[PDB]
Amino acid sequence: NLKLGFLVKQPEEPWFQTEWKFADKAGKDLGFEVIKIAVPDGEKTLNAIDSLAASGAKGFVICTPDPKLGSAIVAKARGYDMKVIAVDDQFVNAKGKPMDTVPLVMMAATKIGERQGQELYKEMQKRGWDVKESAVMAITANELDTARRRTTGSMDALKAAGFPEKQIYQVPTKSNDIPGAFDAANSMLVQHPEVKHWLIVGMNDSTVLGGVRATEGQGFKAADIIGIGINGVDAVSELSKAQATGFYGSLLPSPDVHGYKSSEMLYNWVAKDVEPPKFTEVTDVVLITRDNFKEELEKKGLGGK
Numbered sequence: 001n002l003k004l005g006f007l008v009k010q011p012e013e014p015w016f017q018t019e020w021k022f023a024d025k026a027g028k029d030l031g032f033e034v035i036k037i038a039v040p041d042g043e044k045t046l047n048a049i050d051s052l053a054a055s056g057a058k059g060f061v062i063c064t065p066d067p068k069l070g071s072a073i074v075a076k077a078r079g080y081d082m083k084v085i086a087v088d089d090q091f092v093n094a095k096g097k098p099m100d101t102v103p104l105v106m107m108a109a110t111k112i113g114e115r116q117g118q119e120l121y122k123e124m125q126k127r128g129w130d131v132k133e134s135a136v137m138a139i140t141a142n143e144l145d146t147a148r149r150r151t152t153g154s155m156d157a158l159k160a161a162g163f164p165e166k167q168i169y170q171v172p173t174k175s176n177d178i179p180g181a182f183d184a185a186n187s188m189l190v191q192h193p194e195v196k197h198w199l200i201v202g203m204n205d206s207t208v209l210g211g212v213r214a215t216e217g218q219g220f221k222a223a224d225i226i227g228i229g230i231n232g233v234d235a236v237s238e239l240s241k242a243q244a245t246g247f248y249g250s251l252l253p254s255p256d257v258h259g260y261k262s263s264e265m266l267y268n269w270v271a272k273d274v275e276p277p278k279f280t281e282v283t284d285v286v287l288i289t290r291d292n293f294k295e296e297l298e299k300k301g302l303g304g305k
């Protein structure tokens, strides 16, 4: 044999490499081979399905590079008698409305974004920054629902703790990566010279990291910057550095659970026509910082660091 695909939009992120590793484990346990394909754009996405069909795969797990390709992915898979489960990014129709009929495995995005804002606030308090010279830089990808629900949950948590609404600045990024976030943050930074300390809000580690690299390029030292990412496994190189930076820590969800559990449920669907729940929300989360990242990853089975 049974072949299943595991398609991810960004193979460069440790987040997806970890889903790939745990899907392989599910394969070993249940007796199936996992075909690992990178689908960074819509065209590679449709061509990879064709490719899956030529290898005899019976279904695939996918994290789409664009939620709007949902209809087409479903259409091509139905054509090849393949089942599909989405992992992390939900499929939406042309109008941006959720395609509720494709089983989805994903993190509790709002809750994790809210924890990000609660932890930003906490560290800010511990540093004693004066709120009057502080501000939040929120790097958003609003067209991606999962991303939007994390950055909105984070801004909402900050506003709820008392961070002044008018000191929250949003800036859209063109790409969910360091270069995109960098660009975005750099453009906001020169517009606010009055700010002496920044909170950086981003849906994932790469976005917060681009934001931190920009603050360093504008003269901010690490004590005046607080950024907390989301993914965990993606921030290990940052947290491993000799010196501390404005990247304080990351919220470690469960990519191991997403890789193994979406592969297992696919397998059960394809091999026993056992229908997966439509929605699996994983609430797992732990704050990893320079002080505990090695222990927390080893405790989750993601050894090395």
Ligand SMILES: C[C@H]1O[C@H](O)[C@H](O)[C@@H](O)[C@H]1O
Residues within 6 Å of the ligand: 013, 015, 063, 088, 089, 107, 146, 176, 203, 204, 230, 231
């Ligand atoms: C949970 C995942 O959500 C999206 O797909 C992000 O782009 C990934 O980096 C990861 O944070």
